[PDB]
């Protein structure tokens, strides 16, 4: 089957087992609606996994986008993952409203220790500045800059200060545990 390392389908998680690490009766609902989630995971080694993050959110157009980045990431490759940046010359999405990126992440054991989960992080969005097109920006009914907070915080009574949970998946991406 594979002709080297890091090409093995056998370290890939069942997608049915990649799911929210927590649930809440109330999440933060500031800023445009979004759906932010992990859709796939692959075990690298130890507590390190490669994952696919999927982002969908009400947006302006690519031309209006100044910067779009994941920050606060607990990762062996560092805490920032820019997917678009006019300043830093990163051009890795086609549409701010719907995109995916891959992240290499550290994990911790979940409350069910058949699973692991990633650590909290933020997605920062910046529109309409610093060289971006201003076309449509006056009509935008939301702030030009904002953060989505991702995490399973220490809730009381099911009330979270985060917009969305972090995700969990089976330890080692095993199908059976």
Residue numbers in the entry: 16 to 192
From the paper:
Flo11-type adhesins are of interest in the context of kin discrimination, because Flo11 from the budding yeast Saccharomyces cerevisiae (ScFlo11) confers cell aggregation by homotypic protein-protein interaction.
Given our finding that Flo11A-mediated cellular adhesion appears to be well-conserved in Saccharomycetales, we wondered to which extent structures are conserved. Therefore, the crystal structure of Flo11A from K. pastoris (KpFlo11A), a variant from the family of Phaffomycetaceae, was determined at a resolution of 1.40 Å. The core motif of KpFlo11A, the FNIII domain, showed the highest degree of similarity (0.70 Å for 61 Cα atoms derived from the β-sheet), whereas the neck-like subdomain and the apical regions deviated from ScFlo11A. Also, both the KpFlo11A and ScFlo11A surfaces were quite rigid given the low thermal B factors found for their surface-exposed aromatic residues. Thus, the core and aromatic surface patterns of even highly divergent Flo11A domains appeared to be conserved, explaining the functional conservation with respect to cellular adhesion. We also measured possible heterophilic interactions between ScFlo11A and KpFlo11A, where we found a clearly decreased interaction with a KD of 121.1 µM. Thus, both ScFlo11A and KpFlo11A are competent for efficient homophilic interactions in vitro, but they are able to clearly discriminate between each other.
